[PDB]
Design an enzyme around this catalytic site. Structure first.
Site, PDB file in Angstrom:
ATOM      1  N   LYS A  66       2.889  11.129   7.918  1.00  0.00           N
ATOM      2  CA  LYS A  66       2.189  10.666   9.123  1.00  0.00           C
ATOM      3  C   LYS A  66       2.806  11.189  10.403  1.00  0.00           C
ATOM      4  O   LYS A  66       2.629  12.361  10.729  1.00  0.00           O
ATOM      5  CB  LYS A  66       2.099   9.145   9.127  1.00  0.00           C
ATOM      6  CG  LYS A  66       1.292   8.651   7.995  1.00  0.00           C
ATOM      7  CD  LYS A  66       0.709   7.301   8.246  1.00  0.00           C
ATOM      8  CE  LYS A  66      -0.382   7.047   7.217  1.00  0.00           C
ATOM      9  NZ  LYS A  66      -1.605   6.560   7.854  1.00  0.00           N
ATOM     10  N   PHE A  90       0.838  -1.178   0.000  1.00  0.00           N
ATOM     11  CA  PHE A  90       0.000   0.000   0.000  1.00  0.00           C
ATOM     12  C   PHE A  90       0.878   1.234   0.000  1.00  0.00           C
ATOM     13  O   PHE A  90       1.708   1.419   0.879  1.00  0.00           O
ATOM     14  CB  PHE A  90      -0.966   0.006   1.193  1.00  0.00           C
ATOM     15  CG  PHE A  90      -1.975   1.105   1.121  1.00  0.00           C
ATOM     16  CD1 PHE A  90      -1.612   2.410   1.423  1.00  0.00           C
ATOM     17  CD2 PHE A  90      -3.266   0.848   0.691  1.00  0.00           C
ATOM     18  CE1 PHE A  90      -2.521   3.438   1.331  1.00  0.00           C
ATOM     19  CE2 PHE A  90      -4.188   1.873   0.602  1.00  0.00           C
ATOM     20  CZ  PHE A  90      -3.805   3.179   0.923  1.00  0.00           C
TER      21      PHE A  90
HETATM   22  C1  LIG Z   1      -1.495   5.072   7.777  1.00  0.00           C
HETATM   23  C2  LIG Z   1      -2.723   4.550   7.031  1.00  0.00           C
HETATM   24  C3  LIG Z   1      -2.825   5.082   5.616  1.00  0.00           C
HETATM   25  C4  LIG Z   1      -3.921   4.361   4.829  1.00  0.00           C
HETATM   26  C5  LIG Z   1      -5.050   5.340   4.526  1.00  0.00           C
HETATM   27  C6  LIG Z   1      -5.753   4.913   3.271  1.00  0.00           C
HETATM   28  O1  LIG Z   1      -5.677   5.632   2.284  1.00  0.00           O
HETATM   29  O2  LIG Z   1      -6.389   3.865   3.250  1.00  0.00           O
HETATM   30  N1  LIG Z   1      -1.523   4.848   5.002  1.00  0.00           N
HETATM   31  C7  LIG Z   1      -1.166   5.405   3.834  1.00  0.00           C
HETATM   32  C8  LIG Z   1       0.161   5.133   3.177  1.00  0.00           C
HETATM   33  C9  LIG Z   1       0.537   5.913   2.085  1.00  0.00           C
HETATM   34  C10 LIG Z   1      -0.355   7.031   1.601  1.00  0.00           C
HETATM   35  O3  LIG Z   1      -0.500   7.968   2.644  1.00  0.00           O
HETATM   36  P1  LIG Z   1      -1.655   9.091   2.621  1.00  0.00           P
HETATM   37  O4  LIG Z   1      -1.948   9.467   1.216  1.00  0.00           O
HETATM   38  O5  LIG Z   1      -2.916   8.508   3.283  1.00  0.00           O
HETATM   39  O6  LIG Z   1      -1.116  10.283   3.432  1.00  0.00           O
HETATM   40  C11 LIG Z   1       1.752   5.672   1.464  1.00  0.00           C
HETATM   41  N2  LIG Z   1       2.589   4.670   1.912  1.00  0.00           N
HETATM   42  C12 LIG Z   1       2.235   3.888   2.975  1.00  0.00           C
HETATM   43  C13 LIG Z   1       3.205   2.817   3.389  1.00  0.00           C
HETATM   44  C14 LIG Z   1       1.009   4.117   3.632  1.00  0.00           C
HETATM   45  O7  LIG Z   1       0.512   3.180   4.498  1.00  0.00           O
END
Ligand SMILES: *CC[C@H](CCC(=O)O)NCc1c(COP(=O)(O)O)cnc(C)c1O
Ligand SMILES: *CC[C@H](CCC(=O)O)NCc1c(COP(=O)(O)O)cnc(C)c1O
Ligand code: FES
Lengths: 461, 461
Positions: B319, B179
């Site tokens: 984050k 993800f």
């Molecule tokens: C920390 C949870 C979040 C998941 C939210 C979702 O969209 O379902 N993680 C996102 C994440 C991204 C993208 O971050 P953002 O766009 O939500 O700020 C990129 N890389 C990783 C490893 C994670 O988990």
């Protein structure tokens, strides 16, 4: 709260700026940097730099500062002890919103909802606004096709490995001269400048011509009518052509005024017809107000000038709005959660500021002020065009959203650079256009201040 | 500053939450909403809801709250009159940075730079960090192919209309279970859950298997070695296969621990070899620390466990770090401005907060505390696994970044729901895993607190 006028001490960038630019250049490419700023001493229409220079700012951080620097009403919000939590406890808004989330949306974004759009999702910038608008449109279009049927096993399996039919080969139609962001989805719909696009993988999606009006407008009524009609026909041909290629156009995206691509305008009639073409072919009509939204054209949303009860299916925004997001029609509402989603979905601190911004816009009658001050600005530009046809052409605008062309890129940059050293921050767009994006506290007297400075620049240029 | 323990008044969501959830659902799909929160009354490890419930929060806004709610050091920053401007005057950072921009970066992100990466660009979330990391990689790849020569005329013309060779057909290799965000670029590299992907157009990019390890680890040494070796070979075959398809793999993206896809771990040896494969084939190695970054594994960046002098070419974060962005090697520095760019490029207010967060992490020795408290957590989970094999399996973790599986999705959700009503916020990932993302002021006495509550839950289950 505002200064009485500009005050220059040095060339810009000055010594302290050039030093900070050298430091920053170690860590990243810093060639874009104009100069370093003292935001603490900046007030109203005036940006102060680190060398003590104070410039009338008619660019406003690329049209993103709504009511000037260090606005006293915004100062007071940050000073309130009850607002501390909002700035230091950022929620995952999709799952754990704060108590006041809905009410603060009612004080801000819902109070300026476009006609026919009851739904709202928030986002942190214009790029994720458009990306998620695209996805909302793709989801809607597939939903139309499959009807009441469930997702199929084949779709659930293939979508995980980036394959059809789970991942459809659908398209968004965009226009030459457009700019809608630079994430890989947005970038496909952007056609501004080659340096923005080159070396980045794209999507094979249809690209239509945006009308190029000839000026002055009253000497080219027929020609401009025919130009707009040619563009509308080519839009429709492209929708038909891409249906046959099995890359169905699920939606059309357009700016009410093309910004980064060169302040390109079209008649309200053109947009009304474009909207009709969209509906006719089952394409969602996506209006991008990231840069035109927030009042500078004389209406809160530029599309309001079109005078439609059903102006669009989806509308994105950001910049002046402090937060991003998009309004949409009920029918575009996602059927299930976790499809349109991310961690933060904007920021409650930005909604807090925006509610006050909107209150100031209404109480101080800033929409009408933009029409009035913009009219004074434009009248002065037309005068300068008449007196200096060797440097100025195609003077155009709506509200304070104004611009003109210069003979070539080199003169354009030279005039911006002279103006800045004389106390006026201007912006460029396209290859050879100068643009104006004054904050909403720019008045008719600020227009005259600029106009007198630029008049002298032009006289001995 | 922390409460002494949880205190429940109602089931969750309670009446006031259910009412606010109904209001929000008018405007958007609100099915994801767990409950509404009183952030003003939340402190440290405890989230307080609008019904007065106070829960031990081991999910931390999906791993985005670094040092607990309402941290007194962050309160003081917002209270300082000199910091007002930072919150109300948001710059277009790429052109008009504030005077303190470089120094505040030195106090924050540059003080924790990964090995071998001298460059830094800021972004506002994880998705634009990865999107722009992708573009940085594509530009670097084309640059090494074209050398120190100019853009061709053909490339400049075709890139404007989404066509090769201006828009190359290059790829980023990603892993099953990954993800990386949901903008259309990121989404192509995401393989978490079908609801995330379905109906959205994608890119034909290579997708490799990520190792599914067998537990306990000491009973499956050989099997896990062979599983990892099979995955590495399949990565290499995919790079070769896509080179032949003329969809050259310009870069590889991977999480040190796969989060949303189900807390999937691999050995440090596996990542070291993956890095070597990347270099061998001229692929940029992009490490995504959006969720693993910020100390919870016992090192600031999870990749530090690998023990490499050259761990990666690019590393994204967000984050916990308040702002997004990415570090990279000097050789990945863009050759020209306006290629990696957007309006805001993060937010100086977020950098201000992060500098203090990082200071707290170092002064309070929070990295070592995460290793210790995480060890206590994991030891307790292993005990519960031994006592309740009918409900708990595959207990795993590093630092406080821990998890376990349940027998199916239904029991998973039921155990999360029971735990929450008993005063403990847990998170889910994958189809049937429960995960832990405690803030960095989670101590061992919190670990014991959780373990005692959950132990009683399991006895009663
Ligand atoms: C920390 C949870 C979040 C998941 C939210 C979702 O969209 O379902 N993680 C996102 C994440 C991204 C993208 O971050 P953002 O766009 O939500 O700020 C990129 N890389 C990783 C490893 C994670 O988990
Ligand atoms: C207002 C300036 C900015 C262009 C800067 C650049 O990248 O060259 N406009 C952005 C824009 C977007 C994307 O918003 P964001 O991602 O930069 O926040 C989308 N739509 C429009 C119409 C504009 O102008
Ligand atoms: S894509 Fe909009 S803030 Fe990152």
């Amino acid at each position: 709260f505002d200064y009485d006028g500009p005050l220059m001490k040095t060339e810009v960038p000055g010594p302290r700026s050039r030093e900070l630019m050298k430091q920053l250049n170690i860590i990243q490419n810093a060639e874009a940097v104009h100069f370093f700023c003292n935001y603490e001493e900046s007030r109203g229409n005036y940006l102060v730099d680190v060398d003590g220079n104070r410039m009338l700012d008619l660019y406003s951080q690329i049209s993103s500062i709504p009511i000037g620097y260090s606005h006293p009403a915004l100062v007071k919000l940050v000073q309130q002890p009850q607002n501390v939590s909002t700035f230091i406890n950022r929620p995952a808004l999709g799952i754990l919103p704060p108590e006041n989330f809905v009410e603060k949306l009612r004080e801000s974004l819902l109070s300026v909802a476009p006609k026919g759009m009851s739904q709202l999702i928030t986002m942190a910038c214009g790029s994720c606004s458009n990306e998620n608008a695209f996805k909302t449109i793709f989801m809607w279009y597939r939903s139309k096709e499959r009807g009441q049927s469930a997702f199929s096993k084949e779709e659930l399996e293939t979508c995980m490995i980036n394959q059809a039919p789970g991942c459809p080969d659908y398209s968004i139609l965009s226009f030459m001269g457009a700019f809608h962001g630079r994430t890989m989805g947005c970038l496909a719909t952007t056609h501004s400048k080659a340096i923005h696009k080159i070396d980045i993988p794209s999507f094979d999606w249809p690209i239509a011509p945006f009308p190029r009006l000839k000026y002055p407008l009253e000497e080219f009524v027929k020609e401009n009518q025919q130009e707009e009609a040619r563009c509308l026909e080519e839009v429709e041909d492209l929708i038909v052509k891409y249906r046959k290629k099995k890359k169905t156009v699920a939606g059309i995206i357009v700016e009410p005024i093309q910004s980064e691509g060169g302040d390109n305008h079209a008649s309200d009639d053109f947009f009304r017809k474009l909207r009709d073409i969209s509906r006719k072919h089952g394409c969602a009509f996506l209006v991008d107000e990231v840069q035109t939204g927030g009042g500078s054209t004389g209406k809160f949303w530029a599309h309001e000038h079109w005078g439609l009860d059903d102006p669009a299916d989806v509308m994105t925004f950001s910049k002046k709005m402090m937060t991003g997001g998009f309004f949409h029609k009920e029918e575009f509402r996602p059927n299930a959660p976790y499809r349109i989603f991310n961690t933060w979905l904007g920021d409650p601190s930005k909604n807090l500021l925006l509610a006050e911004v909107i209150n100031i816009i209404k109480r101080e009658d800033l929409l009408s002020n933009a029409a009035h001050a913009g009219k004074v600005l434009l009248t002065g530009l037309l005068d300068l065009q008449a007196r200096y046809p060797q440097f100025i052409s195609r003077v155009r605008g709506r509200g304070t959203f104004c611009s003109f062309d210069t003979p070539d890129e080199s003169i354009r940059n030279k005039l911006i650079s002279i103006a800045r050293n004389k106390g006026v921050m201007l912006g460029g767009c396209g290859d050879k256009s100068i643009r104006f994006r004054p904050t909403l506290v720019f008045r008719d007297h600020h227009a005259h201040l600029f106009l007198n400075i630029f008049s002298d620049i032009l006289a001995d240029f």
